[PDB]
């Protein structure tokens, strides 16, 4: 028994000077969870959401996904809900309640308009499918906003210093 891991990555303009913090965080998680039983997927979102790496355990594909993430130029609005949607879709198709699934979202949690409520809803859908939602805060992230997405404050960490904590919690 082991895990399916979903990276939901904010590439909006508001985090562009910190893409490197986000990339590094992803690489360093991809390097820890190297077991052949583990599968990862990389998702990026700004004003659209895109699967950069479909859920997979092949080591070559992941590596290729990382090179891909490295090329990201962050720009756009912050439609986090479209990122969680793409995670949820892949989870649904993976067996759903069958799998041990985990979403990690990287973002400053700075959401506008109807995005907080659509993220909240997508987050709840995620939990309804047997997945846990974690949020790793970038910069001066909005604490409350991320608590409303993640399972609880237990699953909300700063990016800076939250690799250690996040690996023990697994």
């Amino acid at each position: 028994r082991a895990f399916d891991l979903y990276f939901v990555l904010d590439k909006s303009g508001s985090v562009a000077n910190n893409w490197i913090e986000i990339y590094n965080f992803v690489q360093q998680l991809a390097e820890r969870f190297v077991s052949p039983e583990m599968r990862l997927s990389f998702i990026v979102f700004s004003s659209q959401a895109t699967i950069i790496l479909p859920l997979t355990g092949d080591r070559g594909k992941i590596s290729k996904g990382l090179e891909d993430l490295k090329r990201v130029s962050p720009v756009g609005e912050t439609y986090i809900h479209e990122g969680l949607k793409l995670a949820n879709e892949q989870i649904q198709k993976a067996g759903g309640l069958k799998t041990s699934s985990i979403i990690i979202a990287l973002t400053d949690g700075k959401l506008d308009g109807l995005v907080p409520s659509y993220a909240e809803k997508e987050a709840k859908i995620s939990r309804s499918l047997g997945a846990s939602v974690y949020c790793v805060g970038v910069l001066d992230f909005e604490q409350a906003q991320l608590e409303r997405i993640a399972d609880s404050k237990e699953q909300v960490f700063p990016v800076k210093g939250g690799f250690q904590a996040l690996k023990g919690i697994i």
């Binding site: 700004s46 130029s73 109807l114």
Partner: protein, 676 residues
């Protein structure tokens, strides 16, 4: 206004009129000074006639007298009062009653230019003065050779006349080639058989003399340009809700429907409304989802509107009635205004209510009994899918403010109605629809001949050149007919099917292959329709400009005043802006790979106008409010314009909301280091 209508002749026998004018008092003189537009030899007046009424303020006996009693006959209510001598005859006059006046003057031996002539009266206490201002008034010139009773002598209307403004007086004088060309006043012609040559409510004389509603368009003061109102509804914003919220701006355009490549025939009023397809709030999706609208619900609609008069005459007591329409022909609503309770007047080139005031709401909030405007589910999806409405406005305009010759005032006359006048205008004029002002269709009608009517035989000839000048203000500063810096050849001529044949035959008859060569030779007839359109643009079937060639679009963006990670500052021409629904910003890598910043059909509204007149194309607006971060100076920032005809207004059938697939036009492309 004034007193007696005066006609001055250079001959001795009432045959060659040199001046038609009126004077406010008994001073009927025309000094040397005022004869500048009369040939020198013709400045010797050998006879004159005056005509009108006196109302007196005190009943009494009066003696009339003039400066030249031996040269004069005078009648008062058809009795002679002076006659070939200082026939000094007391006559009773009661106050409040009007008495017809006619003075005749014949002088063989004219030793002086102009005329020095004064009409006097003496009361029974022997006080003699020049008759003062509030006694003499004009003859009733409502529907001495003057067949149509407008006041302008038949000979002048047919041969042509100049209208010259003095200090108070208007001078109406015959046209002479080698004097009036040099000075820049127009040659008027009118029908001696038609009180209003344009068939409208104001006479040829009222028009050129300014005895007319102050609100009639200045061009419609020319007797060959029709004065009538043209009204459509302009919608500003709409609010949609679930019936027991979506707020969007709208743009509206008055419309003209061609047929199948050909100008149309109908005289209806219509406008089409575009509902803004750009986002209001950050996460928004489908209108339906934002609202909570399920399959059996209804939606309610409310909107702000103004009326718009693009005609040439005002409206006073009745707004036209309007159907709000969805799709081809689902009337959602009738929009009525309370008759005879207009809060202002609806003037040419103006709005109701005027721009300094709040607009009208389809359902005002005070009014608990206003009719709700509802949509069924299916219709609301239609509205979301087409984002378009149409407003059909009838031509019912109410009563007319006409001139009254006993008051000298302009008043709304309850026997005068625009419904009776409009058909006559439509029947006896040519219609030109022209879009050069700001690409809005503006309509004008010009008096023209029906070649088949035996009584139309004496109506002025109308060429296409004159019609454009007098109706729209094209002019010829340096040999070329133009409108505001734009040559006539920058505009396309399109005609209705029948006009088209007529024009084509005229050209063949002329051996001309090109209409621009022979604009002064092409004759207009009644019932022609001419559609004149800026050549830079593409037009839909309603004749709204909806796009432009890629080349034109690219050229209009050449002038890049300033560029930066925040956006572009450019000078773009007001017409071009009108045809762009938005812009797309894209970053490109060394290897040609592309990523749109504002990557959603509803995020293209990033351009805005500045007070200095310049356009800002705002990179921050959908970049979480920040300048673009260009990690590599060898990347390009490409910026694309999207035309109206190319706008996507909803997600793809497959639910794809990106800019993927949009026909867009490259208008700027620089590298990181080339911008700064």
């Amino acid at each position: 206004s004034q007193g007696l209508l005066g006609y001055y002749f250079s001959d001795l026998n009432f045959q060659a009129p040199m001046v038609v004018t009126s004077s406010t008092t008994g001073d009927l003189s025309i000094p040397s000074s005022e004869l500048e537009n009369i040939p020198s030899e013709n400045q010797y007046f050998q006879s004159a006639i005056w005509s009108g009424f006196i109302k007196v303020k005190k009943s009494d006996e009066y003696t009339f007298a003039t400066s030249a009693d031996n040269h004069v006959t005078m009648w008062v209510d058809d009795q002679e009062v002076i006659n070939k001598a200082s026939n000094s005859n007391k006559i009773r006059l009661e106050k409040g009653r009007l008495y017809q006046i006619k003075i005749q003057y014949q002088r063989e031996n004219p030793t002086e230019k102009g005329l020095d002539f004064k009409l006097y009266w003496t009361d029974s206490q022997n006080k003699k003065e020049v008759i003062s201002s509030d006694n003499l008034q004009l003859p009733e010139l409502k529907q001495v050779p003057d067949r149509d009773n407008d006041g302008i002598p038949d000979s002048l209307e047919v041969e042509g006349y100049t209208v010259d403004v003095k200090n108070k007086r208007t001078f109406l004088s015959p046209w002479i080639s080698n004097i009036h060309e040099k000075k820049g006043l127009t040659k008027y012609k009118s029908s001696p058989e038609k009180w209003s040559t344009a068939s409208d409510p104001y006479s040829d004389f009222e028009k050129v003399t300014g005895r007319i509603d102050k609100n009639v368009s200045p061009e419609a003061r020319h007797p060959l340009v029709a004065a009538y109102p043209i009204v459509h509804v302009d919608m500003e914003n709409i609010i949609l809700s679930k019936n027991e919220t979506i707020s969007k701006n709208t743009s509206t355009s008055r419309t003209h429907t061609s047929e199948v490549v050909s100008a149309g025939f109908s005289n209806s009023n219509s406008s089409t409304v575009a509902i803004d397809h750009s986002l209001s709030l950050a996460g928004e999706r489908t209108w339906a989802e934002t609202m909570g609208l399920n399959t059996a619900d209804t939606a309610r609609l409310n909107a702000n509107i103004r009326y718009v008069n693009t005609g040439t005459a005002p409206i006073y007591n009745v707004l036209p009635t309007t159907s709000l329409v969805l799709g081809k022909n689902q009337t959602l609503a009738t929009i009525k205004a309370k008759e005879n309770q207009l809060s202002q007047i609806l003037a040419p080139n103006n709005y109701y209510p005027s721009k300094n005031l709040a607009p009208i709401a389809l359902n005002a909030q005070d009014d608990f009994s206003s009719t709700p405007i509802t949509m069924n589910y299916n219709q609301f999806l239609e509205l979301e899918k087409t984002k378009q409405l149409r407003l059909d406005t009838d031509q019912v305009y109410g009563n007319i403010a006409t001139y009254n010759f006993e008051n000298g005032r302009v008043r709304v006359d309850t026997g005068s109605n625009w419904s009776e006048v409009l058909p006559q205008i439509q029947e006896t004029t040519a219609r030109i629809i022209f879009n050069g002002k700001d690409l809005n269709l503006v309509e004008r009608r010009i008096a023209a001949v029906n070649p088949s009517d035996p009584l139309e035989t004496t109506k002025p000839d109308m060429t296409l050149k004159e019609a454009l000048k007098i109706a729209f203000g094209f002019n010829e500063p340096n040999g070329n007919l133009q409108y505001q810096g734009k040559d006539i050849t920058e505009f396309d001529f399109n005609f209705d099917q029948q006009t088209s044949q007529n024009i084509k035959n005229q050209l063949a008859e002329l051996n001309a292959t090109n209409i621009y060569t022979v604009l002064d030779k092409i004759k207009l007839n009644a019932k022609m329709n001419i559609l004149i359109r800026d050549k830079r643009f593409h037009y839909d079937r309603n004749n709204i400009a909806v796009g432009a060639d890629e080349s034109v679009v690219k050229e209009a963006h050449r002038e890049v005043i300033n560029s930066s990670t925040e956006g572009l500052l450019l000078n773009i021409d007001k017409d071009i802006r009108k045809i762009l629904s938005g812009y797309i910003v894209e970053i490109e890598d060394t290897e040609g790979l592309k990523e749109v910043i504002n990557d959603r059909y509803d995020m293209l509204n990033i351009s805005s106008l500045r007070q200095d007149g310049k356009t800002f194309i705002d990179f921050k607006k959908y970049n979480d409010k920040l300048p673009l971060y260009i990690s590599n100076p060898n990347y390009k920032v490409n910026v694309y314009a999207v035309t109206k005809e190319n706008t996507i207004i909803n997600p793809s059938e497959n639910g794809d909301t990106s800019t993927n697939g949009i026909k867009k036009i490259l208008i700027f492309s620089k590298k990181g280091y080339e911008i700064g």
